């Protein structure tokens, strides 16, 4: 029951022919895979790490300027030459100052001078890449056991390791059997276009090309304490006034100046092992060997009593908490639902099969009521506990919320969203291929449009589609206008 | 000369004493006694919490994180007046001197 | 700043987004509009940094 309370959870029903379910785990989101006869487990992608990641193209932030040296030549003969120019540690530019009999030159005219300064950089900003061999996603798994206290408990699940070397990992669960999850970490997140840049023990995930094209001096990337930099002219701001001479400045520290130039990326931890706490991962949850516990237990007879007053989660689920106040052996808890004194059983148990392992400790159940007045009978007999709950809502509203959830999932994941909670089907693959083609075209067209420009482009294109001809009207208007408006209203996460 | 400082801007900041409080859902915004100090920047926000966080009622709760802000290196903007401006002009006459 | 002086248009100097103060030298100048430096990231709705 680790999933309950995260507010970003979502249910995954149905099983395939050989009892496998494809789910795409996301950080901050934990799927709940129910089944006909399997325990309704909860899986959340716990933490993704990376070890022994290398470096490339370490970059410079602020500099020091020392050994300012100047040299000038007589006008109209040669151009100023200084031996320090050949050295990679000195940066300097040519300018044409004036000279005359005041400066001792024989003939009046413009004469070149050069002012070179030593660029000892300081506070580098390393950009580090991670390759697939060292990736390690970690998956936590929790079962709705109806335990005494695991209602929202984030340290009450078995953990399984995942690496690209061995991705078809096992998972041995206590007294429930095992589940095999044959994930593919190769397609979840790119990580071949992602470069981790570290600045003052802070780091983000940036695109490779965007990091490469930064107007700041870049080094080779080796481990040498004193490297040779390139494009040092970006931080020296040579200036000459009145053409008498020119002076050199350091142009300050760009530590906070690039601190909003890097504004759209996600942050990372980079504390020892660099946990990323972002991205997603798809996995195939073949639930064939996972038989639920206590199938053959009897059913109890004595009455139950609530302990914590029943309350509803965000998704309409009811968390009943009961303690079997009797003396019977471990049993299965009965459950019944009636609407308007008519036994229609318009209720479902999100927990697969609730049992009372120990009499003393209370048991908690996550039931799901219908859209209206409904009395939930728990025990058997005349004195059975009865809970009267009224969930306020309608089926149309729930359908609209599910549509919004699916639209958000497609807008964030992209083509992979078709794999979420989807048994292998002909329609799913046919939609997947079409969406891959369309999404590739869309991202090639719009790769690099801002949150404020997508809305404008969508409005302009729907305006074009309002008044047009030859079905370009309908196509452009509906497709591009609606899609671009949604992606301009959702993009920033 | 004799120009006066008008206002000071801050270009480098340090954050100390990060403090946080959170209330249950369907209760007022979380409160610190430090919200009303002149040197504290403090922003309300939301958070999800249910039985896992010790609160009976499920839903979105409100937590606030006040922080004390002190500047490290200000940048001054100083206006110049008109009763102190002094121009200086050299008048060198062509004498054909050596 | 740091032994560098510039001449800027007065209105532009007021417009730029940095926390300002009264200007008269004193202890603990209470900064105004100081939210421009502090950034409040929310770690996917669980807690705040």
């Amino acid at each position: 029951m680790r999933c309950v309370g995260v507010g970003n959870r979502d249910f995954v029903e149905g099983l395939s022919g050989a009892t496998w379910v494809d789910v795409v785990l996301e950080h901050g989101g934990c799927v709940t895979t129910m089944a006909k006869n399997k325990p309704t487990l909860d899986i959340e992608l716990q933490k993704t790490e990376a070890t022994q990641l290398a470096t490339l193209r370490k970059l410079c932030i602020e500099g020091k300027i020392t050994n300012i040296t100047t040299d000038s030549r007589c006008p109209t003969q040669g151009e100023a030459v200084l031996p320090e120019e050949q050295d990679q540690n000195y940066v300097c530019k040519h300018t044409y100052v004036d000279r005359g009999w005041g400066n001792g030159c024989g003939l009046f005219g413009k004469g070149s001078l050069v002012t070179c300064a030593k660029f000892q950089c300081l506070e580098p900003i390393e950009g580090k890449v991670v390759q697939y061999e060292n990736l390690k996603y970690t998956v936590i798994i929790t079962v709705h056991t109806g335990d005494q206290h695991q209602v929202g408990n984030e340290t009450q699940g078995v953990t399984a390791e995942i690496t690209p070397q061995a991705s078809t990992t096992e998972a041995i669960l206590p007294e429930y059997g095992t589940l095999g999850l044959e994930c593919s970490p190769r397609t979840g997140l790119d990580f071949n276009e992602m470069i981790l840049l570290t600045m003052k023990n802070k780091a983000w995930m940036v695109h490779r090309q965007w990091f490469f094209d930064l107007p700041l001096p870049w080094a080779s990337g080796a481990t040498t304490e004193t490297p040779t930099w390139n494009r040092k002219e970006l931080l020296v701001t040579f200036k000459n006034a009145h053409a008498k001479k020119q002076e050199v400045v350091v142009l300050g520290s760009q530590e906070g100046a690039m601190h909003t130039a890097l504004t759209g990326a996600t942050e990372i931890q980079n504390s020892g092992g660099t946990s990323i706490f972002a991205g997603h991962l798809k996995c195939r949850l073949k639930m064939d060997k996972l038989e639920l516990k206590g199938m053959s237990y009897a059913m109890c007879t004595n009455t139950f009593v609530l302990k914590k007053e029943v309350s509803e989660t965000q998704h309409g689920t009811i968390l009943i908490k009961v303690e079997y106040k009797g003396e019977d052996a471990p049993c299965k808890i009965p459950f019944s639902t009636e609407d308007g004194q008519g036994k229609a059983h318009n209720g479902r148990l999100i927990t697969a099969n609730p049992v009372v392992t120990k009499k003393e400790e209370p048991v908690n159940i996550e039931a799901e009521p219908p859209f209206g007045e409904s009395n939930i009978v728990i025990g058997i007999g005349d004195n059975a506990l009865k809970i009267n709950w009224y969930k306020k809502g309608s089926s149309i509203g729930k359908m609209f919320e599910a549509t919004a959830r699916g639209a958000r999932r497609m807008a964030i994941l992209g083509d992979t969203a078709w794999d979420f909670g989807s048994v292998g089907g002909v329609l799913n693959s046919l939609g997947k291929m079409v969406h891959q083609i369309f999404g590739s075209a869309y991202t090639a067209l719009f790769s690099g449009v801002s949150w404020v420009m997508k809305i404008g482009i969508g409005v302009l294109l729907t305006w074009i589609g309002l008044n047009s001809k030859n079905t370009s009207m309908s196509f452009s208007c509906i497709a591009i206008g609606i899609i671009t408006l949604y992606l301009g209203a959702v993009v920033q996460a | 000369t004799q120009l006066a400082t008008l206002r000071k801007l801050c270009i480098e900041g340090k954050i100390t004493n990060i403090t946080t409080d959170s209330r249950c859902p369907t209760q007022g915004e979380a409160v610190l006694p430090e919200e009303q100090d002149q040197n504290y920047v403090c922003k309300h926000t939301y958070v999800d919490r249910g039985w896992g966080n010790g609160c009976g009622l499920f839903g979105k709760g409100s937590l606030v994180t006040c922080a004390k802000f002190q500047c490290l290196e200000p940048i001054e903007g100083k206006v110049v007046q008109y009763e102190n401006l002094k121009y200086t002009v050299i008048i060198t006459v062509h004498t054909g001197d050596q | 700043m740091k032994n560098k002086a510039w001449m800027v248009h007065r209105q532009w100097f007021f417009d730029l987004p940095l926390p300002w103060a009264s200007g008269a030298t004193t202890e603990t100048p209470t900064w105004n509009r100081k939210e421009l430096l502090v950034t409040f990231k929310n770690a996917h709705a669980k807690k705040q940094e």
Partner: antibody
Amino acid sequence: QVELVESGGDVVQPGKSLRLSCAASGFTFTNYAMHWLRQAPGKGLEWVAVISSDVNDKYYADSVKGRFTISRDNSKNTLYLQMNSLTPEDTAVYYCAREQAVGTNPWAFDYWGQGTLVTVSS
Amino acid sequence: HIVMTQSPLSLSVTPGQPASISCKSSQISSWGSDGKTYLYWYLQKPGQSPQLLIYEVSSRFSGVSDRFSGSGSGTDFTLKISRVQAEDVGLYYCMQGLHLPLTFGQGTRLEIK
């Protein structure tokens, strides 16, 4: 680029007073919370006293309580440590340290002064 | 006052080998309000004023070679030096910063074997 220089270390007989001055440069001195530090030869570093950004939040250590006075003068960019009732145990090289520019602690050490030694004997 | 204990009082390592120092506190150095362990580490080079290496534990001060790395949590912290150079000889001082009477640990040392 920060530069901290010490002054005032000299030989002195027990009981007599002495004032230690820490001149600082390269940063706005008035918006900081300076510290004092010391180390006897062959021993570890020992904390002495702290003056906060606001001049009215001074503190001292137990072994030096009620015997030392720490004071800042913002205008002259110097840190004054007036020490009284000095003893031959208290003699050591004294370090003047700066605050942590990047971090969360209100009290920490980014940069240490050059260090002056005060010699106490009969 | 916090008693600070450093596991080694002298380390002799040949160049190219890792040297690790363990500094165990006497009480918890984790500030509960923010959940950050406030520990510090200083290197005093021979005949020099000490500098700073590791503010907090995970973080690392600027102008510091990438080899130095802080580790540990909850009263038992640890440094690591992947490759030791001739310039790493000195007097590494772990100090707590949580409580106002800042107490350094007894000075450890690192000499080339």
